[PDB]
Amino acid sequence: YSVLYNFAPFFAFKCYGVSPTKLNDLCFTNVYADSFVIRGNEVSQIAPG
Amino acid sequence: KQLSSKFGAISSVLNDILSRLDPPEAEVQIDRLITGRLQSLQTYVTQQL
């Protein structure tokens, strides 16, 4: 996850459940990645509930 | 057996919560676990008495 900050400056990066600093020590399985584009003001709509 | 109950928190394992979360949200997760287990202990002490 050290290559995330080396790509581009992020906009929100708000994280739920896990902190976006201690993401290199816990171990789990089968992540899921989805990609799309949002027209600016509706980024906050991509959230639980 | 009340140790394994989540009490509405992220997880029942306390070290997982302290090792996966920042203290701003770990504070409220700790608070929920403390009040649930304290209610269980109060019930146990009342029944024992």
PDB file of C-alpha atoms in Angstrom:
ATOM      1  CA  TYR A   1       0.000   0.000   0.000  1.00  0.00           C
ATOM      2  CA  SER A   2       3.036   2.311  -0.084  1.00  0.00           C
ATOM      3  CA  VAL A   3       2.485   2.722  -3.849  1.00  0.00           C
ATOM      4  CA  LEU A   4      -0.898   4.403  -3.303  1.00  0.00           C
ATOM      5  CA  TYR A   5       0.582   7.723  -2.166  1.00  0.00           C
ATOM      6  CA  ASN A   6       3.165   7.667  -4.977  1.00  0.00           C
ATOM      7  CA  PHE A   7       0.545   7.822  -7.753  1.00  0.00           C
ATOM      8  CA  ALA A   8      -1.595  10.933  -7.215  1.00  0.00           C
ATOM      9  CA  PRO A   9      -2.866  13.166  -4.392  1.00  0.00           C
ATOM     10  CA  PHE A  10      -6.146  11.758  -3.102  1.00  0.00           C
ATOM     11  CA  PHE A  11      -9.420  13.631  -2.655  1.00  0.00           C
ATOM     12  CA  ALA A  12     -11.205  12.064   0.330  1.00  0.00           C
ATOM     13  CA  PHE A  13      -9.615   8.668   1.239  1.00  0.00           C
ATOM     14  CA  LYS A  14     -12.019   8.339   4.182  1.00  0.00           C
ATOM     15  CA  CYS A  15     -11.875   4.853   5.629  1.00  0.00           C
ATOM     16  CA  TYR A  16     -14.473   2.792   7.469  1.00  0.00           C
ATOM     17  CA  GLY A  17     -13.724  -0.101   9.793  1.00  0.00           C
ATOM     18  CA  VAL A  18      -9.951   0.021   9.309  1.00  0.00           C
ATOM     19  CA  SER A  19      -7.658   3.021   9.610  1.00  0.00           C
ATOM     20  CA  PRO A  20      -5.765   4.154   6.488  1.00  0.00           C
ATOM     21  CA  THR A  21      -2.465   4.046   8.367  1.00  0.00           C
ATOM     22  CA  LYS A  22      -2.244   0.545   9.886  1.00  0.00           C
ATOM     23  CA  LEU A  23      -2.982  -1.289   6.639  1.00  0.00           C
ATOM     24  CA  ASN A  24       0.360  -3.135   6.477  1.00  0.00           C
ATOM     25  CA  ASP A  25       0.051  -5.397   9.539  1.00  0.00           C
ATOM     26  CA  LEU A  26      -3.404  -6.999   9.619  1.00  0.00           C
ATOM     27  CA  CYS A  27      -3.931 -10.042   7.414  1.00  0.00           C
ATOM     28  CA  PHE A  28      -7.102 -11.098   5.606  1.00  0.00           C
ATOM     29  CA  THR A  29      -8.176 -12.613   2.295  1.00  0.00           C
ATOM     30  CA  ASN A  30      -9.936 -12.010  -1.033  1.00  0.00           C
ATOM     31  CA  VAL A  31     -10.123  -8.258  -1.495  1.00  0.00           C
ATOM     32  CA  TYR A  32     -12.509  -6.783  -4.052  1.00  0.00           C
ATOM     33  CA  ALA A  33     -11.692  -3.833  -6.314  1.00  0.00           C
ATOM     34  CA  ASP A  34     -14.239  -1.950  -8.424  1.00  0.00           C
ATOM     35  CA  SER A  35     -13.613   1.096 -10.601  1.00  0.00           C
ATOM     36  CA  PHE A  36     -15.882   3.789 -12.040  1.00  0.00           C
ATOM     37  CA  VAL A  37     -16.121   7.569 -12.490  1.00  0.00           C
ATOM     38  CA  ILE A  38     -18.260  10.073 -10.562  1.00  0.00           C
ATOM     39  CA  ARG A  39     -19.111  13.655 -11.585  1.00  0.00           C
ATOM     40  CA  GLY A  40     -17.574  15.448  -8.621  1.00  0.00           C
ATOM     41  CA  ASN A  41     -20.326  16.344  -6.169  1.00  0.00           C
ATOM     42  CA  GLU A  42     -21.617  12.760  -5.787  1.00  0.00           C
ATOM     43  CA  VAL A  43     -18.433  11.139  -4.449  1.00  0.00           C
ATOM     44  CA  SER A  44     -19.967  11.249  -0.957  1.00  0.00           C
ATOM     45  CA  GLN A  45     -22.847   9.127  -2.282  1.00  0.00           C
ATOM     46  CA  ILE A  46     -20.413   6.199  -2.555  1.00  0.00           C
ATOM     47  CA  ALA A  47     -20.657   5.300   1.135  1.00  0.00           C
ATOM     48  CA  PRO A  48     -22.482   2.768   3.350  1.00  0.00           C
ATOM     49  CA  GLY A  49     -26.130   3.802   3.355  1.00  0.00           C
TER      50      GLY A  49
ATOM     51  CA  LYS B   1     -20.143 -17.051  26.809  1.00  0.00           C
ATOM     52  CA  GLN B   2     -20.860 -13.298  26.841  1.00  0.00           C
ATOM     53  CA  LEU B   3     -17.234 -12.678  25.796  1.00  0.00           C
ATOM     54  CA  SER B   4     -17.926 -13.769  22.201  1.00  0.00           C
ATOM     55  CA  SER B   5     -20.867 -11.381  21.738  1.00  0.00           C
ATOM     56  CA  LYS B   6     -20.092  -8.373  19.559  1.00  0.00           C
ATOM     57  CA  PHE B   7     -22.431  -5.974  21.457  1.00  0.00           C
ATOM     58  CA  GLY B   8     -22.946  -3.995  18.262  1.00  0.00           C
ATOM     59  CA  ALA B   9     -19.230  -3.326  17.785  1.00  0.00           C
ATOM     60  CA  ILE B  10     -16.954  -4.205  14.869  1.00  0.00           C
ATOM     61  CA  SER B  11     -15.663  -7.429  16.433  1.00  0.00           C
ATOM     62  CA  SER B  12     -15.641  -9.272  19.745  1.00  0.00           C
ATOM     63  CA  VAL B  13     -11.851  -9.703  19.819  1.00  0.00           C
ATOM     64  CA  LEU B  14     -10.498  -6.660  21.635  1.00  0.00           C
ATOM     65  CA  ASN B  15      -6.922  -6.801  20.325  1.00  0.00           C
ATOM     66  CA  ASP B  16      -8.271  -6.898  16.758  1.00  0.00           C
ATOM     67  CA  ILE B  17     -10.148  -3.640  17.421  1.00  0.00           C
ATOM     68  CA  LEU B  18      -7.083  -2.027  18.989  1.00  0.00           C
ATOM     69  CA  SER B  19      -4.828  -3.222  16.141  1.00  0.00           C
ATOM     70  CA  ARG B  20      -7.133  -2.316  13.231  1.00  0.00           C
ATOM     71  CA  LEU B  21      -8.597   1.079  14.172  1.00  0.00           C
ATOM     72  CA  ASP B  22      -7.485   4.610  14.952  1.00  0.00           C
ATOM     73  CA  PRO B  23      -8.251   5.866  18.505  1.00  0.00           C
ATOM     74  CA  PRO B  24     -10.937   8.356  17.282  1.00  0.00           C
ATOM     75  CA  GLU B  25     -13.193   5.401  16.381  1.00  0.00           C
ATOM     76  CA  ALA B  26     -11.540   2.897  18.718  1.00  0.00           C
ATOM     77  CA  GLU B  27     -12.798   5.136  21.539  1.00  0.00           C
ATOM     78  CA  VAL B  28     -16.455   4.568  20.665  1.00  0.00           C
ATOM     79  CA  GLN B  29     -15.866   0.862  19.903  1.00  0.00           C
ATOM     80  CA  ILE B  30     -14.202   0.505  23.322  1.00  0.00           C
ATOM     81  CA  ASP B  31     -17.120   2.392  24.900  1.00  0.00           C
ATOM     82  CA  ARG B  32     -19.696   0.046  23.356  1.00  0.00           C
ATOM     83  CA  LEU B  33     -17.789  -3.083  24.416  1.00  0.00           C
ATOM     84  CA  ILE B  34     -17.266  -1.733  27.955  1.00  0.00           C
ATOM     85  CA  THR B  35     -20.933  -0.882  28.462  1.00  0.00           C
ATOM     86  CA  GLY B  36     -22.110  -4.243  27.088  1.00  0.00           C
ATOM     87  CA  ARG B  37     -19.749  -6.288  29.242  1.00  0.00           C
ATOM     88  CA  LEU B  38     -20.463  -4.105  32.286  1.00  0.00           C
ATOM     89  CA  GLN B  39     -24.201  -4.708  31.866  1.00  0.00           C
ATOM     90  CA  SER B  40     -23.526  -8.454  31.628  1.00  0.00           C
ATOM     91  CA  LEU B  41     -21.364  -8.357  34.768  1.00  0.00           C
ATOM     92  CA  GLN B  42     -24.036  -6.364  36.630  1.00  0.00           C
ATOM     93  CA  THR B  43     -26.629  -9.003  35.727  1.00  0.00           C
ATOM     94  CA  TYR B  44     -24.282 -11.792  36.861  1.00  0.00           C
ATOM     95  CA  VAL B  45     -23.543 -10.095  40.199  1.00  0.00           C
ATOM     96  CA  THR B  46     -27.251  -9.464  40.848  1.00  0.00           C
ATOM     97  CA  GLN B  47     -28.135 -13.114  40.158  1.00  0.00           C
ATOM     98  CA  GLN B  48     -25.222 -14.291  42.324  1.00  0.00           C
ATOM     99  CA  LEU B  49     -26.366 -12.059  45.192  1.00  0.00           C
TER     100      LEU B  49
END
